[PDB]
Amino acid sequence: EGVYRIMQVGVGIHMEGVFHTMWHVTRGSVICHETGRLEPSWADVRNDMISYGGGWRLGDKWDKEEDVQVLAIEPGKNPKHVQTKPGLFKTLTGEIGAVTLDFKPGTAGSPIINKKGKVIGLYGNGVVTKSGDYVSAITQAERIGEPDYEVDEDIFRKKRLTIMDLHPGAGKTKRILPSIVREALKRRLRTLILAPTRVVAAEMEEALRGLPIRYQTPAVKSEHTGREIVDLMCHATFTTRLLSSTRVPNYNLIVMDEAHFTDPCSVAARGYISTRVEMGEAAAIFMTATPPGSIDPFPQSNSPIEDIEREIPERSWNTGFDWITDYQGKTVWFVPSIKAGNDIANCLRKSGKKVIQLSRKTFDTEYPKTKLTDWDFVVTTDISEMGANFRAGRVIDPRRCLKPVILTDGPERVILAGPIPVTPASAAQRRGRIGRNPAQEDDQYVFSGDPLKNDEDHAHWTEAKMLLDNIYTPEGIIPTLFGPEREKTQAIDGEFRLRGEQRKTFVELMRRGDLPVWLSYKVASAGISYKDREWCFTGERNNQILEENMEVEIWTREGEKKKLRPKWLDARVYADPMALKDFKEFASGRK
């Protein structure tokens, strides 16, 4: 591994298991060699260069007196070393040396030697003097990259939790997670990997090809094999197994991906995992760019982001916002709801734009379209904040969302407050969809408004508590919320504990009935059987559910016409058509 001939259009150096060359040659693609290993890792354009494989690996500069010679591995010819006295190209940022050698287009990327020793710079970029003859600047990366990663050790110590935080570069899935799993298998650990969504879990399987990875489905309450494998499952799958199985594996290493997920199941999962760590029975790793103890809406990125603040349409527009459609790249747009999404998406197609819409229940079947199809826009709810990757150049983020809130004033009900501003963490994740890939145009994060920090009225913290104290363990131990997220609720521990058949109904209401946690709890803690659906009709006048401006009526399981009017009103069962369709299927006694 010394030097090569990029095909010739350019030349590279093969040091450090990384490949050093320039952006203007071969753009930003792959070089085909045996056993592969070729893909963009870092790029710069002021200093024309695309070091890939690793960050960088070229040390020392040429000073100001040392003579520097250039290799001449040119197309059709042999390598011809040529000694020169380096000149000086004075710029605004600083004067860098510039050698004057006569070479033909295609030899760009040849190494220059530090008088005696290794490479001191990269030849193949300069300007022509109309009066003079030839010139090329001594362009060199300064300073170096990271370059690669190796795993720390108390990461695997029992009774230690490790929050591994960094921006959407960054390799937490493609290079870091497999490095951890591989090190885990060497130490023969019962390892659990948790993903937020099934599609993200799919991205882990491909990233973990060659490793004993077994994806675990929620249709199974537990699965044990004498063979030593690694369990891969969704956060919610982990929680439901904790609620439905006694045979709970005592994993000694648990790795949660996207540990910022505020879904009631994810929070509860963090609550349980944290507790197992306190028992000195497991090691935990929480991977997320925005841990609960952070509020930076504009985190770092591995490519320059143009943060633009301007007015953004909340609904259908007709004139004014020419910048939205005049943009000729791919755009990801975050909307607070599916209703808002449709209103936005419909106006976009009128302008002749290919639009794909995304939501929680349509994520698995629409997200693959964002890869196969050529598209102009992607309208999404806050679901894309968790591991959703796009090949876009711009994000339009109104920073608005819907927030489930449990109203205590009077009869308890769950409303979907909003559109209210998102959390500082959420804004960072929406932004982090871009600035991942080095492009000639820096990515644009177009946003509006400021994020709000306080989300202690969010129903999910209470819902996560309801899930937690219904998880039984080798006691006397009560599972509580994960440290930072503990102050989000004033609920006393164990106050949501149910017993036997009530606890059983509670789980089935969620799993078989597809009901929200709060709604499932109210019914189950009321003593109502699962198959009994009479509470769906014995509600107050104001608890009448509407569907496209008309009062919903349901044909019961016996063949009777009743108005959909639940005793407890959770706004999330009739928020969108797909949610309402499912709940009507439940109230009918069809599932």
């Binding site: 024309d48 070393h81 000149g87 190209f89 050698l101 970029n125 600047a137």
Partner: peptide, 30 residues
């Protein structure tokens, strides 16, 4: 083709001071 200095290399090149206009998109100018 390794990082090996060659003493038998040819010596060339003038060394003038060059005021350069550098930019993002491309390389260098005047």
């Amino acid at each position: 083709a390794n990082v090996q200095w060659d003493e038998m290399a040819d010596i060339t090149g003038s060394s003038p001071i060059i005021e350069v206009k550098q930019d993002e998109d491309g390389s260098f100018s005047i």
